[PDB]
Ligand binder design. Structure first.
Ligand SMILES: *[C@@H]1O[C@H](CO)[C@@H](O[C@@H]2O[C@H](CO)[C@@H](O)[C@H](O)[C@H]2NC(C)=O)[C@H](O)[C@H]1NC(C)=O
Ligand SMILES: *[C@@H]1O[C@H](CO)[C@@H](O[C@@H]2O[C@H](CO)[C@@H](O)[C@H](O)[C@H]2NC(C)=O)[C@H](O)[C@H]1NC(C)=O
Ligand SMILES: *[C@@H]1O[C@H](CO)[C@@H](O[C@@H]2O[C@H](CO)[C@@H](O)[C@H](O)[C@H]2NC(C)=O)[C@H](O)[C@H]1NC(C)=O
Ligand SMILES: *[C@@H]1O[C@H](CO)[C@@H](O[C@@H]2O[C@H](CO)[C@@H](O)[C@H](O)[C@H]2NC(C)=O)[C@H](O)[C@H]1NC(C)=O
Ligand SMILES: *[C@@H]1O[C@H](CO)[C@@H](O[C@@H]2O[C@H](CO)[C@@H](O)[C@H](O)[C@H]2NC(C)=O)[C@H](O)[C@H]1NC(C)=O
Ligand SMILES: *[C@@H]1O[C@H](CO)[C@@H](O[C@@H]2O[C@H](CO)[C@@H](O)[C@H](O)[C@H]2NC(C)=O)[C@H](O)[C@H]1NC(C)=O
Ligand SMILES: *[C@@H]1O[C@H](CO)[C@@H](O[C@@H]2O[C@H](CO)[C@@H](O)[C@H](O)[C@H]2NC(C)=O)[C@H](O)[C@H]1NC(C)=O
Ligand SMILES: *[C@@H]1O[C@H](CO)[C@@H](O[C@@H]2O[C@H](CO)[C@@H](O)[C@H](O)[C@H]2NC(C)=O)[C@H](O)[C@H]1NC(C)=O
Ligand SMILES: *[C@@H]1O[C@H](CO)[C@@H](O[C@@H]2O[C@H](CO)[C@@H](O)[C@H](O)[C@H]2NC(C)=O)[C@H](O)[C@H]1NC(C)=O
Ligand SMILES: *[C@@H]1O[C@H](CO)[C@@H](O[C@@H]2O[C@H](CO)[C@@H](O)[C@H](O)[C@H]2NC(C)=O)[C@H](O)[C@H]1NC(C)=O
Ligand SMILES: *[C@@H]1O[C@H](CO)[C@@H](O[C@@H]2O[C@H](CO)[C@@H](O)[C@H](O)[C@H]2NC(C)=O)[C@H](O)[C@H]1NC(C)=O
Ligand SMILES: *[C@@H]1O[C@H](CO)[C@@H](O[C@@H]2O[C@H](CO)[C@@H](O)[C@H](O)[C@H]2NC(C)=O)[C@H](O)[C@H]1NC(C)=O
Ligand SMILES: *[C@@H]1O[C@H](CO)[C@@H](O)[C@H](O)[C@H]1NC(C)=O
Ligand SMILES: *[C@@H]1O[C@H](CO)[C@@H](O)[C@H](O)[C@H]1NC(C)=O
Ligand SMILES: *[C@@H]1O[C@H](CO)[C@@H](O)[C@H](O)[C@H]1NC(C)=O
Ligand SMILES: *[C@@H]1O[C@H](CO)[C@@H](O)[C@H](O)[C@H]1NC(C)=O
Ligand SMILES: *[C@@H]1O[C@H](CO)[C@@H](O)[C@H](O)[C@H]1NC(C)=O
Ligand SMILES: *[C@@H]1O[C@H](CO)[C@@H](O)[C@H](O)[C@H]1NC(C)=O
Lengths: 430, 430, 430
């Protein structure tokens, strides 16, 4: 049976790394509603005009989406204006960051891990294949008005932004609480990260070798850990399917003698063709409207993700959020962002307690008619003596008048025990 | 008239409980577009195929929603992997939790309060009535392709999750800052919750009886307080209305001689029936598309709520958020989650100051040419003497050299007063 | 080259003000689907009924949006129940708030800045022009079923709410951590805002004149700084465009002999008119459905913004969020909300470090075989002597036994230096 004076306190700990993947953006596309609905046909074009402004409005809606996609990327990545140069030391206290930092030997300045992500995530190809030089109208005709737009920010630009966000200000002064995760005086920076989670400084300095070894090992595990990227792979598959719908639907003779305008204008009287053409226009218009509606709703989902990604970057990467399970499970220490196809990947570094054991505890200690409360932390018994220590790491200290405060009375507190508080001044007087 | 040296400090306080209700999920449904649009008719089916892939795509969209609904529930509740057993003490320091914990005597292991919520919130019935054994195709035909899907997680499973989230780790070691709201050494756990809002430990230990009495009373009020659940009742009513739309619309002869396929095929020539059938297909398709669009938009709303509910659970239940009015109005102490039909209910426990009175204050005290600033809290005057105390509870202490720090000069600070700081060492030297 | 013992510490600072603009709400509108689709025509009305409940459902959807718009406003502004009176001092320690507080001499009780916003942001007019007395049906007919609804809360009411939120509780007791940004004992309130960002109290009291001067200057800059409000101007333009779509589309003879019902009923046989009318109904219905869909999606965007605005108000205005870049860039001190057309404007006051210089640092100091760690802050070298100071403002203090704690050993910490720790008791013993 469990009693009401038993506290579990960790005697050891480990450092772990978890991965979060967010779908910041999606491929920018545009559909020319006039070319999609009507091909090389004057009769179709004139009939389409008689249906009013539906076509024009749809172009507007899709354009707005394409613009938002660049806004999303900028809000997430364009937060730092640093250039980012090259660190001439390559040693941050035994810590290995060579796998998260840009590799100078590569064509594209990506880190090893970023490259793993890049080569993992796989209509758009066909459009890309018809182009290469700068003929967009030619391809648009081949693809029935469906075109693909370039991003505002290229892969190289994003890599530069993440290099600035991750490290940036390596050289020219450490900023303990006002800058990127990676800076030269790393051992100290960490000391003020442990403190931020209720772990005193000595814990880091006395265990630098163990901690660095655990950290370096954790990174290696991430490379093998990386399924995994299905969350971003889904982005491409979902968008490709939507485009496939538009293309296939053009072959549907929606109550029509055919799906080909030329086979309606030919071998058919004027008013007969007008009716058949109108039927195809009505169906193709309905199809396009369905597509656009789906894109508007989907785009909203990606916008929400982009906002979250930007928020987490500010609070997890360029800060130390204390929100539970917000920057990963456990006690947040830091985050190292990485670029990825259509999204951002965060490597969250957290502190995890280990090897807990229950010790006997008490509310307060009665010294001489007065109740002494712990200034910080808890009181624990090792079976023969009472000590005062912290909650996130077991390290008993002698209970003295400088570790407690006095309030109320011995006869008021219920869980009061009889122990002795040490007065450090008496030996100095004598 | 008010002066510029008047600070209001609470001399008393109360503990209050507020209720938050969130619509985490909605009933999972599915519509067979082929059966809905076309019944037992070959002619209708063939004509529907001529309209392309519209029907297929709509099935896809609705299926995606049904899946998301289980994801939403899992993100909110499936955060803890504890089993949750039975506490053999039933006494947490005079605190009564019998009304929030599962009742062993019930068929369904719900708490008393959970049961109140369960029996408060009230097409779906009719479908449920035709089934009972496992005949789904038979009902689907009766209900024109409209069917209802079961949840991944049953009510019993949710009750178990909330039991783990609320308490879970009652026996086998208290985890002061790394576990559920309810653990055996409750009086102490609370001490470190009061501290978390700037209220020193003695406040709790000297007032355990009053605090427990207020807490127990507050819970009783909640039972009578529980309108109230309209927020979740709306979920059922909104969804039922949407389904009613689809059913009723089938009776609309949208520019047709009838709304019954059999009355079109009968007493009508082949090409005449084809036209009339196409008109009904076009209308029924438009109706179904309207329905699906509404479900996609609505589903997005519920997804946002589920994400918020999950976030609050992590930060309010399995932590102590300091975000203002995030976990309820006042100073957050803890939260006790409860299950509910189509949602989650949070009972937020907050600290509320009472019986404030304004005292005269000052920036700093001049002792001997040097300005002494409060180490923590404020300086106050009782009319004849100056004392130092905290801000969230009035408890005057003697101003000593250990309660202040020295900076600047007496002649620099504007709101400087002439008082005396007590030096605790002199009596020891003499 | 940079070394691994260099810390940049600010020797000066400035106070800055940034502006955030949020689109809380949008104009409430309603469309009478029956009047829009069918004008003064019995034949059109009867044919519309034959299409079922589409028309009715659309009215429902738009109504729901109009209601949500008032909910959005209430959640953001209706958080405080104070009356707000008049401060008879007009002096908060040299700080000038006359430009953010309501001006008693104006017809509408707005602040100067609020008035700048009001007169900056510019179908709806035409409807507003036909009315003035309370004839809504007359205008509705003139505008083809398109009407405009009044807000629940008028401009005056909002101004009163923001006056309560900004100041409210000026007279009758200061509430250091439980009330609005503006209260009489401002110099002290600020002291506990600087402390909240790791800046000790003396920093404010010794620099009141400089700080007040910077603050007052910053406000003047905002007036000239106020493009700018494009974010809210877009709200009107986007909504106006959507309404223009509905109006223009009524002129489209969507496969019809005309767009005028009277020109179809006249000079045409009964069954011929029925067909032509049905074509117009189908197009006008499709147009209305398109409009409503766009409004539902757009409304969701504004709902998200309203929720964010309300959240920030609680955490930024009625609190001191520590979330990075959440309440503005830099260290958050306070926020002063202002009303605006269709939205809310926040003036964020932040602390920004200035004039940094790198000092030489070290992990710990070895005194006599034992390692002394800083109780708070960092150790720095001025080139000849070691001092201990804080991180957000350079102010060296003598390193004493009361500024450090002892842990581990001299021979364990790597970055250990040989310095002397001062013992303050020896001079008292002698
Ligand atoms: C805390 O846990 C770590 C990891 O288990 C312990 O480090 C291991 O110590 C053993 C014995 O010296 C070595 O053989 C292993 O190689 C170490 N592992 C690693 C990754 O270095 C550490 O000793 C434990 N600390 C305490 C106080 O028990
Ligand atoms: C940091 O990690 C990198 C990558 O794991 C290490 O580089 C590898 O070192 C081994 C051993 O010499 C070689 O066999 C591999 O071929 C190297 N890989 C690459 C990509 O160069 C690097 O040595 C580690 N540095 C430290 C200080 O631990
Ligand atoms: C609780 O801690 C105390 C202090 O470390 C332990 O007492 C010491 O035990 C060591 C090892 O036998 C002796 O060399 C010291 O002289 C003892 N000091 C004192 C003041 O007695 C004590 O044994 C521990 N209790 C338990 C159950 O482990
Ligand atoms: C803690 O110390 C107090 C004070 O010495 C103890 O209380 C006394 O106990 C004796 C023996 O039962 C009584 O005769 C005295 O009258 C008590 N004095 C008071 C003021 O109560 C107390 O029992 C000790 N507690 C423990 C656990 O040792
Ligand atoms: C703080 O407020 C509480 C609640 O009003 C006070 O508790 C009451 O005290 C009176 C007088 O002893 C009793 O008759 C009531 O029954 C108590 N109420 C409850 C719920 O127990 C408490 O005394 C006040 N504290 C102070 C210092 O004034
Ligand atoms: C905790 O609350 C429960 C429910 O209010 C209390 O149980 C009730 O006790 C009264 C008085 O004996 C009975 O008349 C009711 O019939 C009981 N209700 C139920 C559901 O059992 C319980 O006694 C309270 N326990 C404590 C320690 O306060
Ligand atoms: C301010 O507090 C002081 C200290 O409690 C009060 O002075 C004491 O008053 C009591 C009751 O008359 C006396 O028994 C003590 O001897 C007094 N102590 C001292 C040092 O004078 C003082 O009266 C309070 N002032 C007001 C206005 O309430
Ligand atoms: C606080 O103490 C200071 C120092 O004793 C007082 O300042 C002196 O006041 C006398 C009388 O007006 C003057 O003659 C001295 O020249 C002043 N000395 C200085 C350095 O200013 C001060 O007035 C006292 N304040 C209060 C409120 O008692
Ligand atoms: C911190 O920066 C402020 C602003 O630059 C300095 O204030 C200026 O000081 C000069 C010299 O006395 C005056 O001529 C300017 O008019 C002041 N500016 C303002 C706005 O008042 C301040 O002196 C600097 N502090 C330190 C220690 O260097
Ligand atoms: C606070 O700011 C207001 C507005 O800038 C100041 O009022 C202006 O004062 C100047 C100088 O006397 C006049 O020329 C302007 O016409 C005034 N404007 C208005 C709207 O009244 C006010 O004096 C400032 N107060 C303080 C203490 O700085
Ligand atoms: C580091 O700070 C110390 C203490 O202020 C400086 O030493 C003082 O310098 C002043 C000006 O020359 C002398 O009047 C004091 O007597 C010195 N005090 C001591 C203990 O030497 C020291 O010069 C500063 N070092 C540097 C490089 O600026
Ligand atoms: C800090 O003080 C220690 C202790 O005096 C110094 O260590 C000694 O240095 C001398 C000279 O090299 C050696 O002969 C002793 O054997 C060392 N003693 C120990 C325990 O190591 C240390 O060198 C000093 N460091 C600095 C930077 O002054
Ligand atoms: C609860 O604590 C009291 C006081 O120490 C003790 O007497 C009682 O046995 C404890 N309960 C259990 C089940 O151990
Ligand atoms: C608590 O004590 C029990 C009994 O010794 C033990 O089985 C359990 O593992 C302890 N809890 C922790 C966290 O060590
Ligand atoms: C503001 O404080 C000063 C200094 O104590 C005082 O002289 C003045 O009367 C106070 N103002 C009011 C209205 O009381
Ligand atoms: C502040 O003082 C006035 C005057 O005595 C009083 O009416 C008011 O209630 C006091 N404020 C508080 C919070 O007690
Ligand atoms: C890093 O710190 C060590 C120890 O003080 C020093 O010897 C080394 O030169 C420093 N590295 C650089 C590049 O200054
Ligand atoms: C760091 O030192 C270098 C070299 O003197 C200097 O150029 C740089 O400005 C310093 N960093 C800061 C923040 O002052």
């Amino acid at each position: 049976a469990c009693s009401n004076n038993s506290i579990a306190i960790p005697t050891n700990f480990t450092i772990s790394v978890t991965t979060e993947i967010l779908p910041v953006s999606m491929t920018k596309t545009s559909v020319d509603c006039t070319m999609y609905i009507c091909g090389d046909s004057t009769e179709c074009s004139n009939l389409l005009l008689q249906y009013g402004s539906f076509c024009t409005q749809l172009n507007r809606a899709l354009t707005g989406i394409a613009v938002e996609q660049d806004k999303n990327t900028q809000e997430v990545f364009a937060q730092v204006k640093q250039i980012y140069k090259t660190p001439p030391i390559k040693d941050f206290g035994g810590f290995n960051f060579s796998q998260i930092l840009p590799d100078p030997s590569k064509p594209s300045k990506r880190s090893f891990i970023e490259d793993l992500l890049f080569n993992k995530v796989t209509f758009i190809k066909q459009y890309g294949d018809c182009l290469g030089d700068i003929r967009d109208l030619i391809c648009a005709q081949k693809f029935n008005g469906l075109t693909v737009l370039p991003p505002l920010l290229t892969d190289e630009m994003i890599a530069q932004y993440t290099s600035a966000l991750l490290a940036g200000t390596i050289c020219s002064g450490w900023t303990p609480g006002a800058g990127p995760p990676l800076q030269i005086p790393f051992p100290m920076q960490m000391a003020y990260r442990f403190e931020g989670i209720g772990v005193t400084q000595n814990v880091l300095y006395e265990n630098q070798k163990l901690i660095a070894n655990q950290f370096n090992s954790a990174i290696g595990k991430i490379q093998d850990s990386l399924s995994a990227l299905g969350k971003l792979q889904d982005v491409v598959n979902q968008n490709a399917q939507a485009l496939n719908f538009l293309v296939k639907q053009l072959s549907s003779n929606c109550g029509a003698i055919s799906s080909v305008l030329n086979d309606i204008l030919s071998r058919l009287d004027k008013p007969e063709a007008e009716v058949q053409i109108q039927r195809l226009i009505q169906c193709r218009l309905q199809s396009l409207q369905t597509y656009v509606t789906m894109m508007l709703i989907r785009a909203a989902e990606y916008r929400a993700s982009a906002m979250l990604a930007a928020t987490k970057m500010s609070e997890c990467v360029l800060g130390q959020s204390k929100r539970v399970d917000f920057c990963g499970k456990g006690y947040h220490l830091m985050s190292f962002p990485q670029s990825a196809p259509h999204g951002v990947v965060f490597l969250h570094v957290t502190y995890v307690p280990a090897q807990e054991k229950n010790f006997t505890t008490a509310p307060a200690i009665c010294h001489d008619g007065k109740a002494h409360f712990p200034r910080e932390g808890v009181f624990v018994s090792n079976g023969t003596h009472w000590f005062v220590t912290q909650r996130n790491f077991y390290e008993p200290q002698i209970i003295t008048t400088d570790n407690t405060f006095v309030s109320g009375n011995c006869d008021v507190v219920i869980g009061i025990v009889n122990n002795t508080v040490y007065d450090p001044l008496q030996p100095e007087l004598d």
